[PDB]
Design a protein around this ligand. Structure first.
Ligand SMILES: OC[C@H](CN1CCCCC1)Nc1ncnc2[nH]ccc12
Ligand SMILES: [Cl-]
Length: 167
């Protein structure tokens, strides 16, 4: 039993809700919130910009030190950093950005990072401003993640479209 509320159950392990991931994380304080990151951990917009804003830029400050030490992430890769005031940990995961010409096949590799954590609050990777098809992102999530994932979908029409089209 966990403290996630109001989710629709899609499979044995994948749950979905229409919600702002920032507000969800503040309420639940999950062990892990997933950020839709880029390789430079520059949290400018989308989920990343919103999560960073909610930390009063502390996420960005921590991220800049991470990059200065380690260099950029790989597309499809991840790192674990602090969750600040939102969660215990933030798993920064880089899905391919179609608006940069990155290979969509890397979306499966990106979701594989979730399997290192028993329970996660997450967005749909490569959706939104990353330019991929969200129906596809959900399909890959369900077919790749085996741990318990609580998906927060920002947009209501998308959420309803995602639920109504789910196989
Ligand atoms: O897939 C990621 C989605 C993309 N979404 C954005 C709205 C329009 C349709 C596409 N972004 C978010 N998902 C959950 N919480 C969020 N907080 C801020 C952004 C955000
Ligand atoms: Cl977005």
């Amino acid at each position: 039993v966990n403290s996630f509320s109001g989710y629709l159950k899609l499979t044995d392990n994948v749950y979905i809700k229409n919600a702002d991931i920032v507000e969800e994380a503040k309420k639940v304080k999950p062990t892990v919130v997933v950020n839709a990151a880029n390789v430079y951990l520059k949290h400018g917009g989308g989920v990343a910009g919103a999560l960073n804003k909610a930390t009063n830029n502390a996420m960005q400050v921590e991220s800049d030190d991470y990059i200065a030490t380690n260099g950029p992430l790989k597309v499809g890769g991840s790192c674990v950093l602090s969750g600040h005031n939102l969660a215990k940990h933030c798993l920064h995961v880089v899905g391919p950005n179609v608006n940069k010409g990155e290979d969509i096949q890397l979306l499966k590799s990106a979701y594989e990072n979730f399997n290192q954590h028993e329970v996660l609050l997450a967005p749909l990777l490569s959706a939104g401003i990353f330019g991929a098809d969200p129906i596809h992102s959900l399909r890959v999530c369900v077919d790749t993640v085996r741990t318990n994932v609580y998906l927060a979908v920002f947009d209501k029409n998308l959420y309803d479209k995602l639920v109504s089209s789910f196989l």
